């Protein structure tokens, strides 16, 4: 959350929040309604985003562990897509990428290397999901959604 | 708890030097003053209430705010607690004078005293002052009784103060 970031930044200097940080806090809490609306949009459309993104991802990358005939692998890939959509919704709510980075980005390469999932394929799937999500949203609301999808893609690459 | 003779005898086996010359000399020196220690304890016991009363009155003279509203000696409840605790201190100091050893003070007077006083908000400065006042009154009574070499009488009181007082330097 951006509030935690501001408080920790102030605390590292052992000082009360500066007027600029208070302005940042006020501007963030001012826009809470739009963030809640965007998170609700992502939550409602998560399944169709996952379905369409999976269709595009399997059309574009057919040689992937998801569509290797393993039902469990397909289900796990779908669940991972839903989980990353949920984490992006969390980040939209918090006004910062801290939820997404602390739940699904720090150590993502280690986890997926241990799982033996190609990282390029995950990047392609994330791109397809980002396109699907940006389809079902206005551009002004999709700014942070695209930014956080790009954050995931950069963390994987 | 141990007295001087018990501690010296146990240390004789502990240190491996047995009953050498320094131990014999210290034992003789201690036994030279035993009758004076018994006499000092008798004087303290025979005048305990007067000593405590005089010391607490002098304490309230030097700390007039203690008995004022908001003070720690405010009300007869806390006044009685003052007198009771000063009697505790005098009794255990007399014990330590008889024994010639401070282990009684360590085990039955000073163990956990600071924790109790912090819990109850008992000020340590006035406590040390009251102990020193009781020591001065005891010295005056001993001089009146005719005792001459009573340096050891200082040892418990001062020691207790050093154990309860906070570190300033």
């Amino acid at each position: 959350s951006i509030v935690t970031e501001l408080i920790l930044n102030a605390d590292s200097e052992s000082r009360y929040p500066a007027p600029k940080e208070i302005q940042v806090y006020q501007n963030f809490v001012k826009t809470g309604e739009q963030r809640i609306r965007i998170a609700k949009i992502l939550a409602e459309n998560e399944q169709r985003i996952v379905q369409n993104g999976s269709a595009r991802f399997w059309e574009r990358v057919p040689n992937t562990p998801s569509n290797s005939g393993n039902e469990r692998k397909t289900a796990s890939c779908q669940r991972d897509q839903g989980w990353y959509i949920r984490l992006i919704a969390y980040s939209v709510l918090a006004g910062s990428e801290k939820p997404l980075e602390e739940i699904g980005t720090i150590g993502i390469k280690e986890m997926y290397n241990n799982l033996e999932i190609p990282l390029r394929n995950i990047v392609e799937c994330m791109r397809c999901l980002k396109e699907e999500a940006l389809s079902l949203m206005s551009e002004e609301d999709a700014l942070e959604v695209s930014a956080y999808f790009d954050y995931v893609m950069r963390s994987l690459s | 708890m141990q007295d001087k003779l018990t501690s010296v005898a146990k240390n004789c086996d502990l240190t491996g030097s047995s009953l050498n010359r320094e131990v014999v000399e210290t034992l003789k020196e201690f036994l030279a003053d035993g009758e004076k220690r018994v006499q000092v304890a008798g004087v303290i016991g025979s005048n305990a209430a007067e000593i405590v009363k005089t010391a607490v009155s002098l304490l309230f003279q030097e700390y007039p705010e203690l008995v004022s509203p908001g003070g720690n000696a405010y009300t007869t409840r806390r006044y009685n607690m003052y007198v009771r605790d000063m009697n505790y201190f005098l009794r255990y100091c007399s014990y330590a004078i008889v024994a010639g050893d401070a282990s009684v003070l360590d085990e039955r007077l000073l163990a956990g005293l600071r924790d109790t006083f912090n819990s109850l908000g008992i000020p340590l400065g006035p406590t040390a002052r009251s102990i020193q006042l009781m020591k001065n009154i005891v010295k005056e009574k001993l001089v009146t009784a005719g005792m001459t070499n009573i340096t050891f009488v200082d040892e418990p009181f001062d020691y207790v103060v050093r154990e309860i007082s906070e570190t300033e330097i």
Binding site: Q26, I36, A43, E46 | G121, P123
Partner: protein, 161 residues
């Protein structure tokens, strides 16, 4: 640490599900209270040293604590008590801004009791000082924001016992 938004996010995340309507309502409540929280933080920042001065005058001055032999005797121990009170005030402001007491538990209270016991600091006196600080803040800011800050002051006082 962790604020209100992160607390709701984690409550949803341990179950692996999006924020349920009750969590969304709580988040909206925090978003609406953010303006009052910011105003209170500004007020406390402006008068931090004055708040600590009033706290010390109200709860510690002219008692046996500052008298010779007391724990606030000597200038270094007085300044150390003032430093601890400054820490308490700053972190209460942090917790009020965050809407959560998590930072107080993490940074201030986890080990303060044993530290004070080792140092000989009277814990009852410091609890009374924290309550006096709560009174000073509620007089400076107001009733509603004073109560909001007093929530975290009370959490500090409870953690000190």
């Amino acid at each position: 640490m962790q604020d209100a938004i992160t607390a709701l996010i984690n409550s949803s995340d341990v179950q692996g599900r999006y924020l349920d309507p009750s969590s969304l309502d709580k988040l909206q409540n925090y978003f609406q209270s953010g303006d009052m929280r910011a105003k209170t933080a500004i007020a406390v920042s402006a008068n931090a040293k004055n708040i600590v001065t009033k706290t010390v005058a109200k709860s510690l001055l002219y008692t046996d604590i500052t008298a010779p032999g007391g724990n606030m005797y000597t200038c270094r121990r007085y300044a150390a008590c003032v430093r601890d009170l400054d820490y308490f005030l700053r972190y209460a402001t942090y917790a009020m801004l965050a809407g959560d007491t998590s930072i107080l538990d993490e940074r201030i209270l986890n080990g303060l009791r044993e530290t004070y016991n080792s140092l000989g600091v009277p814990i009852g006196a410091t609890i009374r000082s924290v309550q006096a600080m709560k009174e000073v803040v509620t007089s400076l800011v107001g009733a509603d924001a004073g109560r909001e800050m007093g929530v975290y002051f009370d959490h500090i006082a409870a953690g000190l016992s």
